[PDB]
Design a protein around this ligand. Structure first.
Ligand code: ZN
Ligand code: ZN
Lengths: 51, 370, 44
């Protein structure tokens, strides 16, 4: 029930393509550093991505 | 809430709008600790005049012969809110009628705690436990060596609430049930009730062995009255006080009015010669200056001690008691039979709540006092 | 094929059934709590 009733939420908001390859994270001193590589899909000449 | 934005959620938590236009609700409805499926599609506007209401096949089973009631409710109902209030009220009704499907025990409390408390008693006691473990029956002995049973009926929570305690003996049984009290508590109470009657049971067993008991036949432990027969065609009915059994009981005489007179008269002379050191029988034999016969039952197996109007013993609790004041007839009758006889005839003449008439068999004066 | 014509030991067997009741009732409580989980997840 829950699986479908949630799935419907996604259809509210939307109504495939992996835009972001992969997520990794390291630590410098006191300093968490999350980062991610793109796919040729997400152009930053045209789009203003945050994280 | 007033609005069914919030009142819908607050009354039906489990109703989730799938479609954006809140038009398909789905998910569940709550009902007597039982949630069920529901898939309730509205039209392109909010109208229940047209609505699809589909179910679990489980839900179709429980809305057996209310298919039409709820179809009415859909077309006459204003809002979806009100519909759900009604559909809940209605499920509660359907299930409370079908109330023979319910009740799972708490196994961590019950089965063990019950095995524990029966261990507390001892295993020699238990005589019956139902396969639902709802009923059990226990045994105790008197100081005399008489078996006295106690039936218990148990709830889903035995130690919380009182178990229903059923037991034969005549004075009303009282069980101080606490949630802390157990099978051993009520068992001690049961033994206490047994011994307060210990002298009483002995007096009754004594009467039942040595005298022609008539009118309880295999008496229970609940009987305090004992219709003894003496000679033939006269009887004595005896109610005994259970706390003072050896002491003088209220006793009186049935039969032919010429036979009862000297017996009553000699009881009035010799009632001060009653003594509570002897038994009830060892005081009655010296009070009335008689013996009792030992079961004139087996020799007089058909003397026709039946009404001789209707020819039955046991008409509606009543016994053949009213007799003829005649040596040659001695025919017993019933209150109902003799009254419907002597009122029907011409010859019969009534003073106030008495009828004088002729005995049916011998045509001699017979008197009936209602 | 067969044909049917129709019409110490208790010491340990009490305990074994009591162990089953323990096991069973334990997992009954477990599934009750997964039900409260799902039920809330559903509410919110
Ligand atoms: Zn009769
Ligand atoms: Zn007569």
């Amino acid at each position: 029930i829950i699986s479908k009733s949630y799935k419907a939420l996604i259809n509210l908001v939307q109504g495939s393509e992996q835009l972001v390859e992969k997520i990794w994270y390291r630590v410098i001193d006191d300093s968490l550093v999350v980062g991610v590589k793109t796919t040729s899909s997400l152009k930053l000449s045209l789009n203003d991505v945050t994280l | 809430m007033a609005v069914t934005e919030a009142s819908l959620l607050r009354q039906c938590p489990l109703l989730l709008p799938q479609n954006r236009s809140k038009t398909v609700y789905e998910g569940f409805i709550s009902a007597q600790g039982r949630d069920f499926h529901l898939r309730i599609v509205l039209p392109e506007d909010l109208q229940l005049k047209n609505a699809r209401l589909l179910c679990s096949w489980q839900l179709r089973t429980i809305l057996s012969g209310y298919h039409r009631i709820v179809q009415q409710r859909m077309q006459h109902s204003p809002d979806l809110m009100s519909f759900m209030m009604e559909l809940k009220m209605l499920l509660e009704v359907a299930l409370k009628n079908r109330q023979e499907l319910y009740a799972l025990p708490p196994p961590p409390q019950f089965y063990s705690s019950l095995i524990e408390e029966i261990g507390t008693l001892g295993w020699d006691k238990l005589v019956y436990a139902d396969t639902c473990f709802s009923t059990i029956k226990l045994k105790a002995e008197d100081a005399s060596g008489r078996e006295h049973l106690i039936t218990l009926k148990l709830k889903a929570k035995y130690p919380a609430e009182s178990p229903d305690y059923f037991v034969d003996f005549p004075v009303p049984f009282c069980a101080s049930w606490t949630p802390q009290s157990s099978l051993i508590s009520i068992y001690s109470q049961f033994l206490a009730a047994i011994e307060s009657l210990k002298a009483f049971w002995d007096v009754m067993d004594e009467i039942d062995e040595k005298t022609w008991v008539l009118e309880p036949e295999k008496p229970p432990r609940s009987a305090t009255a004992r219709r003894i027969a003496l000679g033939n065609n006269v009887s004595i009915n005896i109610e005994v006080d259970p706390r003072h059994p050896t002491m003088l009981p209220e006793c009186f005489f049935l039969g032919a009015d010429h036979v009862v007179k000297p017996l009553g008269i000699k009881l009035s002379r010799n009632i001060h010669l009653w003594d509570p050191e002897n038994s009830v029988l060892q005081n009655l034999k010296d009070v009335l200056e008689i013996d009792f016969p030992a079961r004139a039952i087996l020799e007089k197996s058909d003397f026709t001690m039946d009404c001789g109007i209707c020819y039955a013993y046991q008409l509606d609790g009543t016994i053949p008691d009213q007799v003829c004041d005649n040596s040659q007839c001695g025919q017993p009758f019933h209150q109902i039979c003799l009254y419907e006889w002597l009122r029907g005839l011409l010859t019969s003449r009534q003073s106030f709540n008495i009828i004088f008439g002729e005995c049916p068999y011998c045509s001699k004066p017979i008197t009936l006092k209602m | 094929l067969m044909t049917c014509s129709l019409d110490e030991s208790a010491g340990q067997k009490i305990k074994e059934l009591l162990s089953g009741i323990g096991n069973i009732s334990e997992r009954v409580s477990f599934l009750k709590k997964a039900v409260d989980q799902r039920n809330k997840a559903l509410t919110s």
